[model samples]
Target: GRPEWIWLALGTALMGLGTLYFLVKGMGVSDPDAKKFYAITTLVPAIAFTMYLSMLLGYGLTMVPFGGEQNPIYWARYADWLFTTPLLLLDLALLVDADQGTILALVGADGIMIGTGLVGALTKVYSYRFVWWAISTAAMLYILYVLFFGFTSKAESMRPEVASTFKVLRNVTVVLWSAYPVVWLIGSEGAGIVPLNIETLLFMVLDVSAKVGFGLILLRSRAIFG
Candidate 1:
């Protein structure tokens, strides 16, 4: 056997565990506003769980040929990212009472980023792959502006108690998000410098940190429930 199935199996298991954790943790939240956090935190991993299940079943993946061989590009991942990423961003935005307009702008740019990333990753031609990748990065730059300048400015207006909680979530979101590009560069999706399983392994860790870990910290905040 080629042993490629191991990563897929692990991906499914990890996301399933994450999804259940969120649901179990969410049941005790009675506050309506607090339920918003529970909804997003729960939904994020639930979407990921389904996406990973699709991958594990092999329907969500396709072979992209390069360098005399084919490496699987998990197309379902873009769909997962497309939906869950924005919701998580929304979760953070609401925590700080970020305005409606700012929330939409951040979401719009995030869509472009994920959309362009999907296009770039699927493009078989060598040169054009990077061209679209650059486009995705350009979109991410605007998202960065919103995360740093726009969100931070909003946070500054709020009281220290809430602002402190927002800062950790915001900073964690920023730091974890920045590594996605790095993983893409080194993994099969970009330069093809790493083996497929290793790439999968790294992405799994990063995702668990971003989705599950972020949710735990957000739910643990006394400010939300208090």
Candidate 2:
């Protein structure tokens, strides 16, 4: 059945307190002040967790269990380890020594994010209509980069275990990158570039192309089998 409204209210309050802790102390624990340019990298997942957990609690209280936000506590715990810990560890390791290649790549990514933020702020201030198109274009460019460089590099770098991991990461990244267009469609923001049905079709095609086609024909064939 449904929990009482009072119970729901209490859960919400607890979740909010958890979020405040996450923003202040939890972030510091996971991500200490060890990096020069990026100190709050550890807080990304915490923020995402708070939002997701809050929604989950809301849904659970309202008897909406199937919307996938049914278990906020579980999801929050999972996100902490899955997203935050690995990133925090990576950032700390990088901070300890830091590498030229890694630093340069991070700097490049930061520059892109900063430029996007600046453009967004300017658009918000000036009420520019072109902001949506500009953001979409930038996202599309990022997808192109992932497609052209990320996949091939993944295949080249790993032999067995890494290959599987790389394939999973690449496919997930592709799907996520494609989601922006879908979101814009939901908001009635874009020309529905490709339309909903077409987008679905493209996703299906890309799935088979990356997984079955790439895996069976290219990676898992005689070279690795025989």
Candidate 3:
């Protein structure tokens, strides 16, 4: 059955408005370290976009060009290549810090990036964009902190475990941050609590888990510290 676009639109609008209000109020009251929050929100969408594009390209190439739908293994291999290519490109870009024309390849790799960027802009006008942007931005900032301060800049950071810890922090941030939007949509629409129920939960969990989790994990891991 088709979704009722009217209801969906109304719910989305209310949720977005609520998110904007919460953000404005939070900023006005306390500047609550929102950078890390927005960074994670940015990355997860980029990752999801890559995944969807890979799936599309994989299906298109294998079926249309190779004509191998009958061979599940062959299609699977193609899909793997499709998905892994973007990840590899991103990793290479980050590792080398060289343009190397890798981002150029991303355009063909996943058309979704452009579309997502457009929708993200539209989401800003709708109000929910602030919430989403805050989450991803925070995660990105956290990752940058680890990369520059925790590893690259720290004289005591020559260990493999130190690097691994940063990687895990980035990954965890992405996962937890990505879930905020989903939870907000569900709770806001279902319960009508808007900023109180879901948005509050989103910020609370992110604050506790992202900061405290990294601290606890690193504190326990002697390899990273000593």
Q: Write the per-residue lDDT of candidate 1 for residues 1-226, one digit (tens) a residue.
A: 3345677677677677878887887897898778888888889988987887777777677888764568678788899999989998898787778889988888998899999898878888866878888887888878877878888888778777677888888788888888888788667787888877787777777787788778778877865653
- Per-candidate count of clashing residue pairs (backbone under 3 Å): 0, 0, 20
Tens digit of lDDT per residue, candidate 2, span 7-43? 3344334434433443443333322342221333324
Runs off by more than 4 Å, candidate 1: 1-4
Alpha-carbon TM-score of each model against the true structure? 0.92, 0.38, 0.29
Among the numbered candidates, top TM-score falls to 1
Kindly report which residue stretches of model 3 are placed more than 4 angstroms away from their true locations once superposed. 1-158, 180-195, 224-226
Cα lDDT tens digits, model 3, 166-225, are 456556645664564454343322223343223434533453344334334433343322
RMSD of each: 1.8, 13.7, 16.8
Report the C-alpha displacement of residue 209, candidate 1, in angstroms.
Answer: 0.4
Query: How high is the CA lDDT of each candidate model?
Result: 0.80, 0.36, 0.36
Better of 1 and 2 by TM-score: 1
